[PDB]
Design a binder for this molecule. Structure first.
Ligand SMILES: [Cu+2]
Ligand SMILES: [Cu+2]
Ligand SMILES: [Cu+2]
Ligand SMILES: [Cu+2]
Ligand SMILES: [Cu+2]
Ligand SMILES: [Cu+2]
Ligand SMILES: [Cu+2]
Ligand SMILES: [Cu+2]
Ligand SMILES: [Cu+2]
Ligand SMILES: [Cu+2]
Ligand SMILES: [Cu+2]
Ligand SMILES: [Cu+2]
Ligand SMILES: [O]
Ligand SMILES: [O]
Ligand SMILES: [O]
Lengths: 278, 276, 278
């Protein structure tokens, strides 16, 4: 549904950090259902979120968030003991706020935007081991009136991989011509990257959408990103270009050649993609 | 000419891909007149552009564009047989659109901006060979009312080179104090860069120009870029700083040291340049 | 106060380039009081600045500035002999200008912004030696109406160091909850970086501050930077998150692991910091 809503609710949520069978580490809302990337958390400006977090691993782990109003006790770092011991359980709290005028007359930003969460404790004091292994996930904070998508996809460039997948695999995403597709794009690790989508483009601002003819933001289909960068956008699938198997990839030449490639499969109403072999 | 116009007309155009005597590969509007970078293509929002493309090389080649409304048949990739056989000829179509309100009440962006075209098939499935050899070129799409420059210069950071030129060989550009100079800045290859100009600055938005006093865009003279990034801007030559041999270079220290340097030569009305 | 008063006044200043005892090279306002980074230079749009520069070193050195209206005679490059001989003295001139309509009806940008000065001559004709040794410093140009901070801190990512300091040695900065803190963020050298601040966020525009509700600039807490990049922002210390030892670091994993970390120490009114022992 378009736009909405007001926002300002208290939200409760359970979350777990698990070591997976393949040696990777992931977050999940349920035990045995962890994923890389971790599950999407979407809230509205003003919402308070209480996360009952449980470390089911044999090493210390934490939950650390970007952009959201988290107190030092919910920082998720080793230094101030806001990380979690093996088998332990801690309640992290993320608050959010609406924009508005301060007493001094200046404008307070508001927490709306495309954010992410990750471990800060596994491997090193900066979560190098955790992030490498897959302990990361997307967070979206919505402002009142923000356009809502048909579906949201998370693309994370972690080191030389997309979503910790083996080279030249996925992820591939499906859509029908006209679908409002939202992309959350996060980067992690050592390397700078350049995200690129074939046949689609977005505004380089907060939402990825231009508000009106007054917005001077650059319209792009290619964007440089570094570790811990997060941005997002919405596109109309196949808008002005029609159905097809539209590539997305890192445009760093050796990166794309070594398998940092996926497909945005845009289908006709009848379900066919020209000219693609399933 | 300053400002405008509307669009869009239907444009027809011929383009060729050639192996050069250097060993490099270039695009051109005519056989024997290929260049690195390839020729500039400038259109207005709304224009439809039909390119009669001919691959004169012994390997498969393609034409792939950023930003413009090109259908999957004009994607220029091997994956869906959109590339071209040796000796072959294919018609690529690029469409452009004005911004406007969608039926749902949201705002559709529009094609206007600084874009680029390149090969997607030579060397690898991603045109690593073609791009390295020089198969790249600039594309400008104008919005109705966009300020038009006196001249347009294309600077491409390809790997450790500028426009595939040997270290410490420019290119250099000339202008007179007061000339409205447009720069199209494209990056290709493996490495990140920082584009920098002495004595000049621009807005970090679509046009490179601030619309008015309400535009909050950062005014910059230094910008980080990665492979396939493209941006552009207009500057008034020598504005507030006067004539001179103004350096432009990548600011990555070893890059500038190893030859990623050129000169923006701004002359007095009499033709002289202070210093130099 | 609160806001910038508008220039332009003619300002005179003395500056020295010294080789320090430890082997580093620094700028200073007084002979013997050189620092890395060099001293902050803050002016208002319209101001003219005359810098009486003296090279006290045994090699050639220069003063080169970003963003400000400097003539070719004040470029500070070997090319046009605007660098300074050992023991020599040269008067550099930096001018600034307000935005306005040109004769042709277009809008001229104006000098306002976060800028930097550095050497262009030591080591190579691009100042690679000087910059590595520490010859760099911040420059701020204010526009009329610009919100003034309580304090300004300079964070320079020079190669694998912050402000040429040894790994894991800060620098740390102190503030009290509610203080308007300004950060000037400059990058130099060979490497790309990602600047990140725990518990704080800013707008990705000229001032780092949103003008009003109409500003579409992305609100971020993480930003990719390359050599010679400069940006700045203002934050309300501990806003929405309270006091604490808030971490700042380059988010490139090996960089933070190898010492590119510091602390933004936000104190309670009573001077205590939760979960932090001194
Ligand atoms: Cu951190
Ligand atoms: Cu990459
Ligand atoms: Cu492409
Ligand atoms: Cu982080
Ligand atoms: Cu591609
Ligand atoms: Cu470079
Ligand atoms: Cu410079
Ligand atoms: Cu491309
Ligand atoms: Cu320079
Ligand atoms: Cu770094
Ligand atoms: Cu963090
Ligand atoms: Cu510089
Ligand atoms: O972090
Ligand atoms: O591409
Ligand atoms: O520079």
């Amino acid at each position: 549904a378009r736009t909405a809503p007001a926002g300002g609710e208290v939200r409760h949520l359970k979350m777990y950090a698990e070591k997976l069978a393949d040696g990777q580490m992931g977050y999940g809302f349920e035990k045995g259902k962890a994923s890389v990337p971790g599950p999407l958390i979407e809230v509205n400006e003003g919402d308070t979120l209480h996360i009952e977090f449980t470390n089911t691993m044999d090493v210390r782990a934490s939950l650390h968030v970007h952009g959201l109003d988290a107190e030092i006790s919910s920082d998720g770092t080793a230094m101030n003991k806001s990380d979690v011991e093996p088998g332990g359980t801690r309640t992290y709290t993320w608050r959010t706020h609406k924009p508005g005028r301060r007493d001094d007359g200046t404008w307070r930003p508001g927490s709306a935007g495309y954010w992410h969460y990750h471990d800060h404790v596994v491997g090193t004091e900066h979560g190098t081991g955790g992030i490498r292994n897959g302990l990361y996930g997307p967070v979206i904070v919505r402002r009142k009136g923000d356009v809502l998508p048909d579906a949201t996809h998370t693309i994370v460039f972690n080191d030389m991989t997309i979503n910790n997948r083996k080279p030249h695999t996925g992820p591939d995403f499906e859509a029908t011509v006209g679908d409002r597709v939202e992309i959350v794009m996060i980067t992690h690790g050592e390397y700078y990257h350049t995200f690129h989508m074939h046949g689609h483009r977005w505004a380089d601002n907060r939402t990825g959408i231009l508000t009106g003819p007054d917005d001077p933001s650059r319209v792009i289909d290619n964007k440089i990103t570094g570790p811990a960068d997060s941005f997002g956008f919405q596109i109309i699938a196949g808008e002005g270009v029609g159905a097809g198997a539209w590539m997305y990839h890192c445009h760093v030449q050796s990166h794309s050649d070594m398998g940092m490639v996926g497909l945005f499969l845009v289908k006709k109403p009848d379900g066919t993609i020209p000219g693609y072999e399933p």
